Amino acid sequence: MLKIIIPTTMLLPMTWMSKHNMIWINATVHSLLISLISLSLLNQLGENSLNFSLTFFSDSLSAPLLVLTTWLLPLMLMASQSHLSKETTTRKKLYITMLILLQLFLIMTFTATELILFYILFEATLVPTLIIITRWGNQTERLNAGLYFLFYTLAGSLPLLVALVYIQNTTGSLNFLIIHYWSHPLSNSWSNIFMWLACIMAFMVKMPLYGLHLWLPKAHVEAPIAGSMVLAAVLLKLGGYGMMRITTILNPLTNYMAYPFLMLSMWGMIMTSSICLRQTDLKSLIAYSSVSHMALVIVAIMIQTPWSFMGATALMIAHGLTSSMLFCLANTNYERVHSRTMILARGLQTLLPLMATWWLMASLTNLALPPSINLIGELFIITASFSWSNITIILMGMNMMITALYSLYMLITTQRGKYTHHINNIKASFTRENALMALHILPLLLLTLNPKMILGPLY
Amino acid sequence: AYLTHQQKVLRLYKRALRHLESWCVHRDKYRYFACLMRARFDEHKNEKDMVKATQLLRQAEEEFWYGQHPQPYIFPESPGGTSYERYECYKVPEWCLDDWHPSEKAMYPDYFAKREQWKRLRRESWEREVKQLQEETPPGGPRTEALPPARKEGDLPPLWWHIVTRPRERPM
């Protein structure tokens, strides 16, 4: 994977000694080239993960996330061009360095071989985002935002470290290939429950899970837009990639202690989706929407069925493209109106034709029209959960109905209706943010044509 | 300010007869019933002491409150009508014209020429009207939303632009 790693780190010298105006052009073009090179990673064998090196390996689960990160990186590059114009060149290059460093840690995380190496770069993503959230934020609270996001993830991260090093002393290795191949049943000894626990809350705190999610509304609604997408699109999914990994050994414990988190989640998305319907800030809805969508994933991983894992993977990638779009969409409105209140700028279809479309299928992908990959992930979860328990259907079915309730609500309360006559600064929609939405949406329908590439290794 | 005694009955009499024609439907039937209630309205036109008319108010307003049709005829442009707030999806604020690419402005040259002088007309008018409104307003601010006239020389009516440049009721 150094055919991706080496060019990615080579973006640092190139972006750090380019001209004072070419930093945006240079970073965007070669990051896209990295995305094209990363597209070759879509190739997967029947069941053998691509073992490029001793310390790097990939399969049908890592690559779709890998392409998601690499494809994403130019998207914040173009999104940040708007509000980063009024800055010095050296600080601007510092911003680009954080994004590239964030990307580089992401690729190493997904391509990691053993759990400890995965853990190091996994957590290492906290540092670049911590600077992004805090240094370049917009409001006073961002200082409290960073601490909330940092400690929450760390509070669960440290128990996993103790459990991980404990794995090495007991099993003899932490390599994922050996762990799955040398998998042994886990006893129900009272120590083993905490052993199971210490490998879980690390992944579910950043999912986020119901209860342990408050950093999500306190960061995504408050981070800079560029940091907002990568947080929602991929960073939450870091728990997903880990959980499919760590569950290979933590069996058959999952049968019992999934329950306290299952209905914690099962009552979760319905509860969270209710909060989304009754927000006042724009970005607060999508943030609360993200945990709601992430909640069905938690059930998908934990239930441990092949169908749910495919549904987990599809919903994971689909939500990333979606949540990035709505966060980008909110940023476009926030920039002109200098706020994020929902009913502040209702009724803008008459002035924003193309935006009103970009609202339209972005919300529809949030409603998950058929046959968008959102349903393909969502429906697979439903069938797996129903096979587990019939009474499941009412809950998340009601959730995706209250999900439908709000997912038109901002469409009504941002585009439908009459403009505000005192507002007179909604200028012609610039092609930059405009083309940004195009690059968000077309891969969604393109992947809809051939979804078979994003169901993970269980397909 | 407060709704005067004979003003409140005029409001109640208004929709009560609209309720009547909603009930009667037929024009002649409405005409017969409207005149009957006209004399009924005139039965105690005298009130003398205001306390009597307040009691007469209560019975009267209670009559027309129950006098509503279950589905009264709300006109298409009436509040809640079929055509009410229908074409708001077409009207766009006048400032959007300034946010036009020069090609579109050039291909509508005469209109933007007269829009420019209208934009100019807004300038001196706004200048004159604000230094007209500040002293026309007595201490304690404006006692009511009524706004003073252009009673000076060569002066435009203060606070006129959005009223004059209102989105025309038929934007098409």
Binding site: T350, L351, L352, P353, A428, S429, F430, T431, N434 | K91, V92, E94, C96, L97, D99, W100, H101, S103, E104, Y108, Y111, P167, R168, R170, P171, M172
Partner: peptide, 12 residues
Amino acid sequence: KRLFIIKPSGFY
């Protein structure tokens, strides 16, 4: 006759 119709600048 023809009135004036007002629209956002769709050239972009």
